[PDB]
């Protein structure tokens, strides 16, 4: 009833003053600068605040993004852009890059970078809930929702905003297309993990569970692959997590697939399926150790005992023994040589990311207030 989600560190940024000195001339332009500065500061604080919930994040985030949106969007022409886009330099670290910062003087860069941190916050809020031994039903649902929210933010950043950046991200950086895509995919896989647990707890047909498990594994595999063109040094830890989870959930698939075969009086085949489940599980059991010995971003962990990791282990043995027992007095069936092949159905959509858009430009931005800027120095 608990999950373990590897998390990379949050991004950090230089505090930004929004002080333009002689540029800004007027009470109104000054006020909007203070409101930007303070809304940003409050938002940044929430990322590390333990009392923060999804409501506060959205509330603080909207407050900032709506003000920040005045540096990006035109007030009238949808084909134009704020004259203020380049007024302010923003500086950010990157998820795989440690403390090595990167900077752009582009307000669009800030919007994507901060939004990316908002998305990560949601994945970290989810993973914190997923680790509570006492996690309740509502908390699990929130884990699922939060990951879907995160998926949608990352994706929105990628599709409609990333292409505005005049300096593309360097390989391995958070604002790059390939990396950001892996986060979307991982979120889906992680969120689908929660779904599977409910289906299992709720006693759903084994065909459904097996298929959902298999699709979950596939997502993890795609994420693993998506990152695979990165330098191995700083991706190695993360890819180990994804690959471990991939192997781990394939075992889940073989396990529940065995039930389907056994229920069909194909018990010989069922036994063979469970044997493959043991293998996949052992591979996962090996990979989860390498992760613990592999250096890279985030705290060190040694995945074996998670209530999730051990349950599949008990399920596999009991499900395997059940099959062979049936085989010994009932079926008397041969154990096939080759592992069974997996269905690969189309998407079930249970994993659809919740669409995200930034809020509209704050109504504090008016042509008069905007007029109180630049003036040319």
């Amino acid at each position: 009833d608990t999950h373990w989600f590897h998390r990379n560190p949050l991004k950090a940024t230089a505090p930004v003053s929004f002080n333009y000195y002689g540029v800004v001339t007027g009470p109104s332009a000054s006020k909007i600068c203070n409101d930007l500065r303070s809304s940003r500061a409050r938002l940044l604080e929430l990322f590390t605040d333990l009392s923060c919930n999804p409501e506060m994040m959205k509330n603080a985030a909207d407050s900032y993004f709506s003000l920040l949106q005045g540096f990006i969007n035109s007030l009238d022409e949808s084909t134009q852009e704020s004259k203020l886009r380049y007024i302010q330099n923003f500086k950010w670290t990157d998820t795989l890059q440690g403390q090595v910062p990167s900077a752009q003087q582009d307000a669009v860069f800030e919007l994507i970078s901060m939004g990316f941190n908002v998305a990560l916050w949601y994945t970290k809020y989810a993973s914190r809930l997923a680790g509570k031994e006492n996690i309740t039903e509502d908390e699990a649902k929130e884990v699922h929702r939060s990951l879907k929210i995160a998926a949608g933010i990352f994706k929105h950043l990628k599709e409609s905003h990333l292409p505005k950046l005049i300096t593309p991200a360097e390989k391995g950086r958070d604002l790059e297309s390939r990396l950001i895509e892996a986060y979307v995919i991982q979120c889906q896989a992680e969120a689908q993990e929660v779904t599977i647990a409910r289906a299992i707890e709720l006693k759903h047909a084994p065909g459904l569970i097996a298929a959902l498990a298999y699709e979950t594994a596939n997502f993890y595999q795609k994420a693993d692959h998506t990152l695979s063109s990165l330098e191995p040094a700083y991706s190695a830890k993360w890819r180990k997590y994804l690959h471990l989870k991939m192997c781990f959930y394939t075992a889940y698939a073989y396990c529940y697939h065995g039930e389907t075969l056994l229920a069909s009086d194909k018990c010989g085949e069922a036994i063979r399926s469970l044997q493959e489940a043991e293998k996949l599980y052992a591979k996962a059991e090996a990979l989860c150790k390498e992760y613990g010995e592999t250096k890279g971003p985030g705290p060190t962990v040694k995945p074996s005992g998670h209530l999730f990791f051990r349950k599949l282990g008990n399920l596999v043995k009991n499900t395997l023994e059940k099959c062979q027992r049936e085989n010994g007095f009932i079926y008397f069936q041969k154990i096939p040589t080759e592992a069974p092949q997996l269905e690969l159905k189309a998407n079930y959509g249970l994993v659809e990311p919740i669409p995200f858009e930034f809020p509209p430009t704050s109504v504090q931005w008016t042509p008069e207030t905007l007029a109180a800027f630049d003036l040319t120095k």
């Binding site: 649902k141 929130e142 699922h144 929702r145 779904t195 409910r198 289906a199 709720l202 759903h204 047909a205 065909g207 459904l208 079930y348 959509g349 249970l350």
Partner: peptide, 18 residues
């Protein structure tokens, strides 16, 4: 047989809530 389909809904509703 057909049970698998019936169940599929119960998840869609659980997930399609929030």
């Amino acid at each position: 047989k057909e049970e698998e389909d019936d169940d599929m809904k119960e998840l869609e509703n659980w997930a399609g809530s929030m």
